[PDB]
Swiss-Prot record:
It holds the Pfam family DNA_ligase_A_M. ATP binds at residues 250, 257, 272, 301, 338, 412, 418. It comes from Archaeoglobus fulgidus (strain ATCC 49558 / DSM 4304 / JCM 9628 / NBRC 100126 / VC-16). Its cofactor is Mg(2+). HAMAP family: DNA_ligase. DNA ligase that seals nicks in double-stranded DNA during DNA replication, DNA recombination and DNA repair. One of its GO terms (molecular function) is ATP binding. Its EC number is 6.5.1.1. This is DNA ligase. CDD domains: Adenylation_DNA_ligase_Arch_LigB, OBF_DNA_ligase_Arch_LigB. GO terms for biological process: cell division; DNA biosynthetic process; DNA recombination; DNA repair; lagging strand elongation.
Length: 551
């Protein structure tokens, strides 16, 4: 009929695997997108090609782990899970295994196959809604029903989609460019629209229906997260405060960045990576309802405090993880706001100094809700005094901002600069590992680390880490990595990209040993970052900038 079969999409994706050119990928994808008339097949295709079923800020998650996939594949193929697991290490991809099992199964028991993107979407939406007793088994039954109806190539990309790695060499950059190409829009205005909606599918549909003009007309709306404006690391305090002659200066807090939307009938709170953390923060939510003027979207920092003294940011992260009533008691919080993006209408096109005024009249300071102290100055001595004060208070340094700059969602330019005493850590994808030896043989001991190329979504190796781990760390990480082993050559294993580590280092060197062109000198494990998906790992561009900044 008229509805797109997932198989049409699947065959399209298969052909993209052969193509390594970024421009060629862009042009192929644009051509495909142009010929979709049904706007929800368009929406789904744009999401699906990026390995996404839902936007991260959407409260819906599939909640399907590789173990559920194994059981479903068991059900449909008859082959036992132990054999399917050896097949993943043989083929290096569960998608290729699923393809092989279904190829064998329809050869044995022929039926007509293919399902619509619409059915895939509906089945996914049901799976996402399932909680409680028996929910895991029904999820397996729903997946089993889907694999029973799918072609081998459909089963491949269904599997890769659920695992969020399509392996097509297509990232966010190619998709922005392909949507721009398809629908006669400037790639910069597709980009801009993405930064305020955080749904590329929605953006594609607007580009289809209304072109460039419809994309420019898109506005910030409350409860839809906007990509935060980001700051560059400054070389030094006096170099930053001379590029800008006069500068707005604030503390840089040891905490977690959030964005608060309200309203004023309900509050939503988004984290730095735009996870909806509202239900984790009833304490902050209530304080916002009494202390802030309704109809705003605020940029802020949440910090953990205890008996009047500051606590480190990973304490806020624990709150974000989550009976949440117990957590409010263990880990008290306060919020410090430093910007405003919405005040009965967009206000990001102002003037920092003008936004500041808007911010001041919007919050009524209490014990749990504060404004960032801001000074405006051309004096290096004044900013060093704030810097000193910030550090003595248990925080990191200062933010230095251009008082005339507008707020630019998702952008990391020189209009904001962070100057802190400590160096940066990186968050990097765990792409591989090594088994320990002798007694430690039952644990992974060493981990391969990769940064992200945001245009292609490819992971570029950047180093290897073995220090900074407790033995319970190794116990825990081995258990969570084991199912993801997709290659084992002796001690060397490769993983399905999934987990992100926070990693410290002494130096980034240029090196030919990795695809990235960079190597970490003395990498050291800080912690596992559950708050971070693989597409929130630090980018090759970040690594490059951090390298250049050493000299």
């Amino acid at each position: 009929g008229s509805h797109m079969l997932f198989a049409e999409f699947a065959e399209f994706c298969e052909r993209l695997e052969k193509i390594s050119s970024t421009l060629e990928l862009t042009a192929r994808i644009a051509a495909f997108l142009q010929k979709i008339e049904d706007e929800r097949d368009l929406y789904d295709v744009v999401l699906f090609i990026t390995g996404k079923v839902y936007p991260p800020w959407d409260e819906r998650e599939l909640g399907v782990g590789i173990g559920l996939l194994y059981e479903a594949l068991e059900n449909v193929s008859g082959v036992k899970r132990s054999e399917i697991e050896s097949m993943i290490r043989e083929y290096g991809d569960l998608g290729l295994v699923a393809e092989q099992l279904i190829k064998k199964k329809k050869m044995t028991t022929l039926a007509f196959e293919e399902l619509t993107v619409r059915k895939v979407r509906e089945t996914f939406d049901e799976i996402a809604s399932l909680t409680g007793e028996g929910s895991m088994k029904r999820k397996i039954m729903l997946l089993t029903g889907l694999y029973g109806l799918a072609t081998p190539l459909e089963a491949r990309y269904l599997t890769r989609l659920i695992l969020n790695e399509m392996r097509l060499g297509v990232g966010e950059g190619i998709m922005r460019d392909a949507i721009a190409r398809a629908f006669r829009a400037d790639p910069e205005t597709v980009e801009r629209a993405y930064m305020i909606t955080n749904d590329l599918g929605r953006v594609a549909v607007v580009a289809k229906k209304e072109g460039e003009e419809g994309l420019r007309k898109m506005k910030i709306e409350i409860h839809i997260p906007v990509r935060m404006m980001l700051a560059q690391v400054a070389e030094s305090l006096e170099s930053a405060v001379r590029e800008m002659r006069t500068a707005a200066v604030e503390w840089k807090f040891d905490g977690s960045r959030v964005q608060v939307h309200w309203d004023g009938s309900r509050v939503t709170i988004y984290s730095r990576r735009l996870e909806n953390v509202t239900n984790a923060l009833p304490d902050i939510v209530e304080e916002i309802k009494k202390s802030v003027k309704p109809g705003v979207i605020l940029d802020g920092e949440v910090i953990a405090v205890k008996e009047g003294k500051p606590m480190p940011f990973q304490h806020v992260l624990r709150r974000f993880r989550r009976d949440v009533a117990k957590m409010v008691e263990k880990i008290p919080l306060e919020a410090h706001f430093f910007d405003i993006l919405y005040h009965d209408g967009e206000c990001i096109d102002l003037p920092l100094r003008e936004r500041r005024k808007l911010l001041e009249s919007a919050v009524n300071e209490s014990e749990k809700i504060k404004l960032a102290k801001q000074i405006v100055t051309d004096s290096v001595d004044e900013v060093r005094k704030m810097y000193d004060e910030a550090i003595s208070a248990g925080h990191e340094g200062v933010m230095i901002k251009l008082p005339s700059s507008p707020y630019i969602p998702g952008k990391r330019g020189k209009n904001w600069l962070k100057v802190k005493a400590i160096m940066e850590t990186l968050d990097l994808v765990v792409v591989g590992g090594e088994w320990g030896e002798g007694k430690r043989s039952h644990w992974l001991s060493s981990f391969e680390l990769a940064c992200l190329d945001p245009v292609t979504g490819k992971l570029l190796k950047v180093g290897r880490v073995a220090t900074g781990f407790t033995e319970e760390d190794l116990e825990e990480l081995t258990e969570m990595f084991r199912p993801l082993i997709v290659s084992q050559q002796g001690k060397k294993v490769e993983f399905i990209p999934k987990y992100v580590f926070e990693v410290a280092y002494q130096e980034i060197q240029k090196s030919p040993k990795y695809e990235s062109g960079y190597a970490l000198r003395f990498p050291r494990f800080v912690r596992l970052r559950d708050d971070k998906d693989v597409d929130e790992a630090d980018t090759i561009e970040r690594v490059e900038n951090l390298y250049k900044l050493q000299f």
